[PDB]
Design a protein around this ligand. Structure first.
Ligand SMILES: N[C@@H](Cn1cc(Br)c(=O)[nH]c1=O)C(=O)O
Ligand SMILES: N[C@@H](Cn1cc(Br)c(=O)[nH]c1=O)C(=O)O
Ligand SMILES: [Zn+2]
Ligand SMILES: [Zn+2]
Ligand SMILES: [Zn+2]
Lengths: 258, 258
C-alpha cells in the first residue's frame, strides 16, 4: 500500500512549486523534506503520497478533550503512516508515537530586526520596550510553558499574559512581525529556521546569542508501525553518507539571497 | 536485579576521583556520565554498579570473526545491561543494540598544538609535514574509512598507510602526542572532547575549524531489554528539564583551568 506521508508547509522544508497547478501528486511540492521523503522512501523501498496536514499544526494534546492535533494527531489516529517534517522529538510525543534518531540538530534561538539592542534571552527578560513571542502551538511555546529555569519562566509569564498576543499562527507571520516592528518585536524560534531567514531578502533579520536548548527533529511513525526500524536505519545511513548536510546547504546556503 | 552499567574511563565522562582509595563501588568515580547514570537510575527506578569495560574500547566488529568488542560487545554478549558513556549512535551499532535519543550532540573536529599552521581538514590533506590521526575502534576512525568526500578520503589514504601508525589506543595518548610533537601532529577527535581539553592546562592545544559532521551520543541497551523504553524517556526528560546542559557546564567550563 502507498504510504501516506503527513507534512507541513514550512519553508524551506515543504513549499508549493511555482507551477504546482500544472503538476500532480508529489510533484506539486519542493523543499528539504520533499527531497528527504523521496530518499527515505527509496531506502526503505516504499511508494508514498505526500499530504499537507489538515489543521496546519505540528502536534499537541488538548487537556480536557485529550485529543491530539497536527501531524502527531494524524499518526495517532491513523490518518497518516509517517510524518516527514521539522517535527521536534519531545517526551510527550515519544509517549504516543515513535521517532527515528534526529535528522537535524537545533535549539530555540532569538531573531531580531538588525539593530535591535538585544543579545540574549536574559536581555529580553530584563526589559519590556521590545515585545517578543513564539510560534503559537509548537514545542517552542511548550518549552517556555514548562520551563523551571528562572529566565525562561520569567519570559513565559510575560508572553502568556501579553496583550495583544505575542504568539503567531505561522513562522512567516512571526518574521513579518519582526520585519515591521521597527525593532520593537523579537521572535523566539528554532535555530535552523532563524539561520534560513537570515539568508533571505530583505536581509534585515539576524540570529543573536546562543541557543536556549538543544534538541532534534525526527521522522515520526505511529507506535507499532512496520516502518519504524527501517526508517531509523535510513536516517542514520543518510546522515553518515553526508546527504543531510548536502540538503541543508542546498535549501539554506546554495539558495541564499544575502 | 542490580543493573550492570558498562562505561569507559574518558575525561570528563568517567574519571577516578582524587580521594578514591578511601572509597568503594560507584563512589570511586566522578564525571558527566557518573552523574548521568545516577539520574537515569533514579528516574527509571533501578540500582546499578558501574564497571569499566574490560578491553577499554568503545565498540567495533571484527571483520574476520564477526565478534563485537568494547562496550557494544559487552551488551551484545550480555556481559552488561546498559552502557552509559560517550558512545556514538551509528548505523552498524543500531543494527545490533538499541540507543536512546542523543544525550549530547557533537561532531568530529581537529586538535592542534598552538601555532600549528592548520585551520581545516583541507589544510591537513594539502600537506605532509604535519602528521594526523584518530582514536581506534571508534566512530571517528570509521568515518574517514567510509567517507567518499574528496578531502576526507584523501586524509584516509594517508592515515591508513601512515608509518608509523597515526592511530592511538586512547584519547589521552592522542592528546599527549599532539602536546609533545612540536606541532608536527594534529589530532582528529570528537568536538566535546576537543573543547574540554582546550580548557585544561597546560592550555597548549586548540580546536580549529568547524565540525566535519553531526552525530550524537546515546545510552545503549541490548536488543529486547526491558530497560530500553524507560531509558529513552528518561534521557528526553533530563534534556527537557535542563539537566544535561547543567551537567555539561559543571564538567566543562565550571572546572576549566585556562
Ligand atoms: N518543530 C516544532 C514546531 N516549531 C517550528 C518552528 Br520553525 C518554531 O520556531 N517553533 C516550533 O515550535 C514542533 O515540532 O512543534
Ligand atoms: N564516541 C566514539 C569513540 N571516540 C571517542 C573520541 Br573522544 C574520539 O575522538 N573518537 C571516537 O571515535 C565511539 O562511540 O566509538
Ligand atoms: Zn539515497
Ligand atoms: Zn532527576
Ligand atoms: Zn581480527
Amino acid at each position: 500500500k502507498t504510504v501516506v506521508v503527513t507534512t507541513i508547509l514550512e519553508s524551506p522544508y515543504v513549499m508549493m512549486k511555482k507551477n504546482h497547478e500544472m503538476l500532480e501528486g508529489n510533484e506539486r511540492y519542493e523543499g528539504y523534506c520533499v527531497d528527504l521523503a523521496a530518499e527515505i522512501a527509496k531506502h526503505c523501498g516504499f511508494k508514498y503520497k505526500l499530504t499537507i496536514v489538515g489543521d496546519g499544526k505540528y502536534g499537541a494534546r488538548d487537556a480536557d478533550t485529550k485529543i491530539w492535533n497536527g501531524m502527531v494527531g494524524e499518526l495517532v489516529y491513523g490518518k497518516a503512516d509517517i510524518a516527514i517534517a521539522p517535527l521536534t522529538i519531545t517526551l510527550v510525543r515519544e509517549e504516543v508515537i515513535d521517532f527515528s534518531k534526529p535528522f537535524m540538530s537545533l535549539g530555540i534561538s532569538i531573531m531580531i530586526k538588525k539593530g535591535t539592542p538585544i543579545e540574549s534571552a536574559e536581555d529580553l527578560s530584563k526589559q519590556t520596550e521590545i515585545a517578543y513571542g513564539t510560534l503559537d502551538s509548537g514545542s517552542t511555546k511548550e518549552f517556555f510553558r514548562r520551563s523551571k529555569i528562572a529566565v525562561f519562566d520569567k519570559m513565559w509569564t510575560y508572553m502568556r499574559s501579553a496583550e495583544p498576543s505575542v504568539f503567531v499562527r505561522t513562522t512567516a507571520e512571526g518574521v513579518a512581525r519582526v520585519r515591521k516592528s521597527k525593532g520593537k518585536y523579537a521572535y523566539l524560534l528554532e535555530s535552523t529556521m532563524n539561520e534560513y531567514i537570515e539568508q533571505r531578502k530583505p536581509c534585515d533579520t539576524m540570529k543573536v546569542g546562543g541557543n536556549l536548548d538543544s534538541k532534534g527533529y525526527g521522522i515520526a511513525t505511529p507506535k507499532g508501525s512496520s516502518l519504524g526500524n527501517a526508517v531509523n536505519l535510513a536516517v542514520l545511513k543518510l546522515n553518515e553518507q553526508g546527504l543531510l548536510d548536502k540538503l541543508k546547504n542546498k535549501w539554506w546556503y546554495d539558495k541564499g539571497e544575502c
